[PDB]
Scaffold this active site. Sequence first.
Site, short mmCIF file in Angstrom:
data_model
loop_
_atom_site.label_atom_id
_atom_site.label_comp_id
_atom_site.label_asym_id
_atom_site.label_seq_id
_atom_site.Cartn_x
_atom_site.Cartn_y
_atom_site.Cartn_z
N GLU A 294 0.82 -1.21 0.00
CA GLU A 294 0.00 0.00 0.00
C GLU A 294 0.86 1.26 0.00
OE1 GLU A 294 -3.65 0.34 2.26
OE2 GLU A 294 -3.55 2.52 2.21
N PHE B 265 -10.16 7.51 13.58
CA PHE B 265 -10.33 6.80 12.31
C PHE B 265 -9.79 5.37 12.31
CE2 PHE B 265 -11.81 10.75 10.41
CZ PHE B 265 -12.72 10.29 9.46
N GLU C 26 -4.86 0.42 -2.34
CA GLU C 26 -4.68 1.87 -2.43
C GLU C 26 -3.28 2.33 -2.87
OE1 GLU C 26 -6.49 2.63 1.65
OE2 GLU C 26 -7.93 3.68 0.39
N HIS D 156 -0.58 4.54 -0.31
CA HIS D 156 -1.66 5.54 -0.29
C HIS D 156 -1.16 6.99 -0.21
CE1 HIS D 156 -6.17 5.96 1.04
NE2 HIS D 156 -5.84 6.81 0.09
N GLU E 224 -14.41 -2.92 -0.29
CA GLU E 224 -14.77 -2.22 0.94
C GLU E 224 -16.09 -1.47 0.75
OE1 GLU E 224 -11.53 0.31 2.25
OE2 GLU E 224 -10.01 -1.11 1.54
N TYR E 225 -17.01 -1.64 1.69
CA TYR E 225 -18.25 -0.86 1.72
C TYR E 225 -18.79 -0.79 3.14
CZ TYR E 225 -21.57 -4.83 2.24
OH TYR E 225 -22.30 -5.90 2.71
N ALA E 226 -19.78 0.08 3.36
CA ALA E 226 -20.41 0.24 4.68
C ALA E 226 -19.39 0.47 5.79
CB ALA E 226 -21.35 -0.94 5.01
N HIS E 227 -18.75 1.63 5.74
CA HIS E 227 -17.76 2.05 6.74
C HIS E 227 -18.39 2.13 8.14
CE1 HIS E 227 -14.37 4.65 8.22
NE2 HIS E 227 -13.71 3.85 7.39
C1 LIG Z 1 -10.78 9.52 2.10
C2 LIG Z 1 -9.94 8.92 3.21
C3 LIG Z 1 -10.69 8.97 4.54
S1 LIG Z 1 -9.42 7.29 2.73
C4 LIG Z 1 -10.25 5.92 3.50
O1 LIG Z 1 -9.93 5.89 4.89
C5 LIG Z 1 -10.66 4.88 5.58
C6 LIG Z 1 -10.57 5.21 7.07
O2 LIG Z 1 -11.14 4.18 7.89
C7 LIG Z 1 -10.12 3.51 5.14
O3 LIG Z 1 -8.73 3.36 5.46
C8 LIG Z 1 -10.31 3.37 3.63
O4 LIG Z 1 -9.68 2.18 3.13
C9 LIG Z 1 -9.80 4.61 2.86
O5 LIG Z 1 -10.29 4.54 1.52
NA NA Z 2 -9.46 3.26 9.51
#
Ligand SMILES: CC(C)S[C@@H]1O[C@H](CO)[C@H](O)[C@H](O)[C@H]1O
Ligand code: NA
Lengths: 211, 1015, 174
Positions: free
Chosen positions: A24, A209, A69, A26, A145-148
């Site tokens: 990764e 986060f 990413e 990112h 990945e979906y539904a954070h």
């Molecule tokens: C646009 C950003 C917040 S990226 C976003 O952050 C999330 C935080 O939980 C995850 O790491 C996701 O994989 C990532 O796409």
């Molecule tokens: Na996170």
Amino acid sequence: PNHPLWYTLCDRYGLYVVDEANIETHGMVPMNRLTDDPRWLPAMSERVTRMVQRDRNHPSVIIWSLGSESGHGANHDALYRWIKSVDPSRPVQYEGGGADTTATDIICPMYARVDEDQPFPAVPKWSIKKWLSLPGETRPLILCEYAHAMGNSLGGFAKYWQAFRQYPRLQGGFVWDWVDQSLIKYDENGNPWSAYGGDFGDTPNDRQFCM
Amino acid sequence: VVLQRRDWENPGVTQLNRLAAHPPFASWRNSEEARTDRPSQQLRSLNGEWRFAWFPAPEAVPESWLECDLPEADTVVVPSNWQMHGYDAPIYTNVTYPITVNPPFVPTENPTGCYSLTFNVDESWLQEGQTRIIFDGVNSAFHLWCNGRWVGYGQDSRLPSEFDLSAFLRAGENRLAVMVLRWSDGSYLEDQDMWRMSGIFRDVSLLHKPTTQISDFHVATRFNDDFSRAVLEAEVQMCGELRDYLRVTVSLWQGETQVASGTAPFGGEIIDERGGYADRVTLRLNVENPKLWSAEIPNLYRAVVELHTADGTLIEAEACDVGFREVRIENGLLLLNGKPLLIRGVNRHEHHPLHGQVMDEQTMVQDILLMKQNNFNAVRCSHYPNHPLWYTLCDRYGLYVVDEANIETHGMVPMNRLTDDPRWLPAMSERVTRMVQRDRNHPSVIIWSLGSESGHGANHDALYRWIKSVDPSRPVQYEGGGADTTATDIICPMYARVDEDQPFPAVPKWSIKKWLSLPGETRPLILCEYAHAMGNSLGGFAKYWQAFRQYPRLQGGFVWDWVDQSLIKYDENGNPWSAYGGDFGDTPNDRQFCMNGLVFADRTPHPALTEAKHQQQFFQFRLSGQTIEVTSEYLFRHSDNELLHWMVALDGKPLASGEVPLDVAPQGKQLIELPELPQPESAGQLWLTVRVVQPNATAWSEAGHISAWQQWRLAENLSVTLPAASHAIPHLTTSEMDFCIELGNKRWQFNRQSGFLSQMWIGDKKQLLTPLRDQFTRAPLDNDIGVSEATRIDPNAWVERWKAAGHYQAEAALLQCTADTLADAVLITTAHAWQHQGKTLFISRKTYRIDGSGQMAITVDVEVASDTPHPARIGLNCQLAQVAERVNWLGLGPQENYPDRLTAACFDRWDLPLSDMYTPYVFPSENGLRCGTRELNYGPHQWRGDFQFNISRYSQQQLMETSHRHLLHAEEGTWLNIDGFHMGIGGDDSWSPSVSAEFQLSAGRYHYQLVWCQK
Amino acid sequence: VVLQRRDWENPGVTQLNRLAAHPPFASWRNSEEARTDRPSQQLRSLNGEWRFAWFPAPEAVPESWLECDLPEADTVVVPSNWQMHGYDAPIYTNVTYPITVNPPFVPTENPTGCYSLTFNVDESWLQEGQTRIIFDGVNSAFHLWCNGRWVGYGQDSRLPSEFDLSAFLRAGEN
Ligand SMILES: CC(C)S[C@@H]1O[C@H](CO)[C@H](O)[C@H](O)[C@H]1O
Ligand code: NA
Ligand SMILES: CC(C)S[C@@H]1O[C@H](CO)[C@H](O)[C@H](O)[C@H]1O
Ligand SMILES: [Mg+2]
Ligand SMILES: [Mg+2]
Ligand SMILES: [Mg+2]
Ligand code: NA
Ligand code: NA
Ligand code: NA
Ligand code: NA
Ligand code: NA
């Protein structure tokens, strides 16, 4: 790649596994700066090839992933094809660079919404229902990945499942994610409490986060 | 730590501190100098005299050498290969590695070349900017030092290695030290069939760039459907501090006319969620009615890339030649600018007989002129990226190039052991990626190749896709693992035959016609290697070209190969001679297999070159009555520098001739009606010869250059007139040992014990040194021998079949020898059997009829045992006492021609010095045959009939016993071989029988007749 | 050579002397044990109490540590993350790199964990066969020494690094 016992348990209990390369990048600008660079191809190749060499006999692994990413670079295309050549038995997926690049057998967007388009330049997140039927498109769609599920969340989760059940080529997804990454700290009385980003003097940080 | 790390035995380390690869840079600080491609003051050559010392191993290199010169060292020219200076021996091996196969390890005895240079650096170069050193070619690995301090390490012998010396240099005098290792882990990927050499063999230079610099640029040209419109797209990358005022201008020029120009600040379009490349810009220029690049018309533009401030202060300019062309595969066809190519190709190694693997402009230009003059339009860089000037010359003169990565692992078992191993993916990837980064802007490069003979492994598939992703403009090919794997866009077999299948397990070589139509197959087929031109070869070459023209998806191929890899050595008297494998003490070696060229190492043509020129012609001809039909095989150009010369001759005697300008559109036709030709005064065959002449000089040819020819038989008037009856009657005399015939001053003698004409007299001077005897053998060609050796017999090789059957040792046994006196002649009748260990191989039955006019008519009828291997020839030979200056014949020529290599030869009256009737192949063999001959003249002798002949000072025996041409000695008199029939030479490959059934002498019974007289 | 080469700031060196990757092995010498997936005598866990010392950079590591246990070092459980023992702070950042973006370079202040184990090897392992060490997870890069002698180097925190120790081991304590 996970602790080797993870795949043993997935074989025996019964879970389909996406086994994913430790790659990764990112924080690069743009996201593909390293992955489109031939100088970084050797380092990247080892993260892919040594994963396949280790895990290729596990029935639980049904899909290979090129990582997470890291934009879309030529190195991704090279390694996509390496796996297809070495192991025809599993599809290869990769979300970077727009979720439907030449390096993925599966449209695998993250956080693409059910009905609502998000037309970001270069890497739009189409509604998943619309994505399937774009001119020329034939692949299955499974969100990587979906539904954070961050805090009080999973609002609109039923909307995904309705769509998954109605559309044959919408074949589900992977929720983000299983377990809060909180760490235990102790207060003055030796009482435990859940800590997140910044609670260790770590700075810069991204606070809650991690949960 | 450097000696302690042993980086040359670790495929994981291919370099240290090496800069990124990029297209040719010169860092001009004047835009006009960039446009005109004049020399740059920022690009210095470090070529010339260097200091050199040789060591058996890196461990033996003294530490003093890093800071101070070794007094024991010598002064040598650089670039060079150190084997060419005599420090150690060059090794010739084909497949088997020159070192024990033990990857990644090399021998502890690892020849080490210690190069060093003391040179000046001006103050201005260090005050600001970046000074880098560029090594274009170092074989096979090296550590670099500057002023005693370690700079870095590089591998891959065939691509430039570049290092930042900015922090290492001082104003005034500096010293570079380079430790070059003969063997490294890189050697395992450098197993090409060539001389194994080492050293700093390509240019060394210093490049000054500013801190804020163009670090990369890619040029692309896209087109509308009919190529009446193009967009030039140039992506430019910078290094240094990013600034709002920075700009790139890309301007495009045709001569001194600027055609288009674009200016933009840095900052690419959005790429992904993190933005785009702030350090890159893409410029898009519109070009209306672009002049298109092809090998036919190499139209070029000049692109100048200017890095400058907003108000127009130049920081630096780089530049390249641009050829507007599109390469694509569509519907199974390889297209250039929308038209299907026919590749008239050749593989070319970088070889000089005196300089080894060092290339110079003059040799490169010589090769290109010879190639184009012999109707070649394409070259394959077998098997590595070339000297960078090669691509510039191919751009300008017009040749299609296959650019090929420096990867060959032929000697592995199986061939893909390393290429299927992910451990070797990093080393392989750098050989592919750094080639593409270097050469991607050259219009002459139309195809990328992944390497040579390395089986098919997963690493190939990965790198195939990398190139397809990074560069969509060019197809990728690779022959390994069966020529039609998932790693190739083009079916690109080597030595696959036209009609004959070779169904090897796992990697069959199908007949090329069959291969195309295999179930599911759609791709074009272009042979990466075919027509192995080893020695007396190129038999069956016309068969390939007939097939290429008939089948749309057979789009040609690359001959193996261009130039003999022979090296000059010197004898006791200091006289030069051509050497091959084993001649330097190198062992194991693969002998003469290093010599497969259409040309000798000094670029003198082999006879085979003319067959190639003829078959690769761009004009095709048909005759119908008085009308010649000319068809153009040019795809893009009109015939605006061509005139057709025609000539009608009766048995070599000119009757009528004329000229007609050619006006043929690309792929079009033109009809030319011949005037009424006056009918011949006498008997014989009328022949029409046409040739395409180029009235004007070009960049590649002289005025009067002949590009195409063709011949037909017109009317034939058979002779019905009887030779005037003479009054003389030959007189027969008989002893126990001889029949003798006398007529005037002429005498013939037939030995009654041997049954052969043992002597002839004119006046009373002997004409023969050896009797006239049947001959069924030839000094074996390279194709006859194949890979067979004295200590390792290949029982399948033609030579070993002939040997085992007793052909070379069979002795004539007389069966019958009689004489009769006729009314106006003496008739000698003979019969012989050639036997080997009880088995009768051949029977020869003859009559000799000597009449009153002096003519001897020889009639020969041969029987060949059906179960003996078909003989190399059926004819007679003898050693003539005469040595004459000229050879005059009515037949095919002027050059050497054989039954399966004679399409280029023309029937006419030819007259050459005796020396031209011998072909100086470095490995001696049967040579210098001319076929379809009706009359042969040598001194007072004339032979008539319908025969093949060769004539020289060298017997078939000496030829087969001598391994090098320089060891040959002229024998007393002249050896004449007159054949009624002669086997094909073959050459589809040179390691298995390749002579086609129709050219083998398998008919069982054979008849030919000759008339011998004095003219 | 180790401090001089700085193998941890070169993406061209991702390992030195590392063995080929492969599927899970246990080298059973009994077929029925292999069938039942029962423990193998030829596969030994080195998990447990190890000796550990923290340093702010690799340059701060004393050479004595190669031959001899540092008296100031602690006994800690392995496997572990040293942040979980409080030697330094764990960092939570999402997108932004925890280090300055300047590839292939890393901060000169580079927290360094010096681990060590004194252990015994069965006599039979030294007479015949091949003994390898397998590190299933080392974050993020590491050099290895056995009995004072340098063995190899590895990268990729999430895949096993394996090294042949047959020429390095001895009878008794290692
Ligand atoms: C646009 C950003 C917040 S990226 C976003 O952050 C999330 C935080 O939980 C995850 O790491 C996701 O994989 C990532 O796409
Ligand atoms: Na996170
Ligand atoms: C079977 C072997 C002769 S391989 C054969 O050798 C040739 C010799 O000139 C060339 O090197 C060809 O490329 C190779 O295929
Ligand atoms: Mg190496
Ligand atoms: Mg070869
Ligand atoms: Mg590293
Ligand atoms: Na569904
Ligand atoms: Na064709
Ligand atoms: Na040999
Ligand atoms: Na050869
Ligand atoms: Na010979």
